[PDB]
Amino acid sequence: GAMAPSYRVKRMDIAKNDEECVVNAANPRGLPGDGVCKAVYKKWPESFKNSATPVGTAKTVMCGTYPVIHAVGPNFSNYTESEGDRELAAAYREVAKEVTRLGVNSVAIPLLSTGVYSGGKDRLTQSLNHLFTAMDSTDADVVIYCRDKEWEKKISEAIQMRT
Ligand SMILES: Clc1cccc2[nH]cnc12
Numbered sequence: 001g002a003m004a005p006s007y008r009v010k011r012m013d014i015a016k017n018d019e020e021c022v023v024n025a026a027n028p029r030g031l032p033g034d035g036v037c038k039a040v041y042k043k044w045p046e047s048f049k050n051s052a053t054p055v056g057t058a059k060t061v062m063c064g065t066y067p068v069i070h071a072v073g074p075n076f077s078n079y080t081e082s083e084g085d086r087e088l089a090a091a092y093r094e095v096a097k098e099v100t101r102l103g104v105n106s107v108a109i110p111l112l113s114t115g116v117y118s119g120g121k122d123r124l125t126q127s128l129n130h131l132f133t134a135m136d137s138t139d140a141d142v143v144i145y146c147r148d149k150e151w152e153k154k155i156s157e158a159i160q161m162r163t
Pocket residue numbers: 011012013014039146147148
C-alpha cells in the first residue's frame with residue numbers, strides 16, 4: 001500500500017500517467033474506441049488481447065508488466081438512469097478488486113461514463129462519488145486524470161472537501 005493513501009487529480013493525458021497501473025474507460029468489445037480508450041489503445045495496444053468484458057465489470061490485461069484494467073462503464077444513451085447508475089457503481093467496485101489483487105501502490109483512473117457514454121449529461125459528481133465509494137477502502141494512491149480545466153477545479157474541490 002501507499003504510506004499515506006491519497007487522492008489527486010491531474011489535467012493531462014492518462015497515457016502519460018506516473019502510476020503503477022492504468023484504468024481504461026473501455027468498451028465491452030475490446031475495440032480501440034474513442035477518447036481515453038483510443039489513447040490507451042495507442043499507448044498499450046498489447047493490453048487489448050481478449051480485453052472484451054461486460055458492462056459493469058473490469059478485466060486486467062498486462063502490457064509487458066504494466067497492468068491495464070479495462071473498466072466498462074454503461075453508455076447512458078442505452079441504459080435508464082437507474083440501471084446505468086447501478087452498472088457505473090459496479091464497474092468501479094470491480095476496479096477496486098483489481099487494484100487490490102494487483103498489489104499496486106498507485107493507479108491512474110479516468111471518470112467512467114463522463115465522455116461519449118454520458119448520454120449528453122454532466123456526470124462528474126455521479127461518477128466521482130462512485131469512484132470514491134469503491135476506492136476509499138483501498139490503500140493505493142489514486143490519481144484521477146481529466147481533460148477540462150473546470151472539471152480539474154471541481155474534482156480538486158471534492159477531494160480537498162473530505163480531507
Ligand atoms: Cl489528451 C489530453 C488530456 C488532458 C489535457 C490535454 N491537453 C491536450 N491534450 C490533452
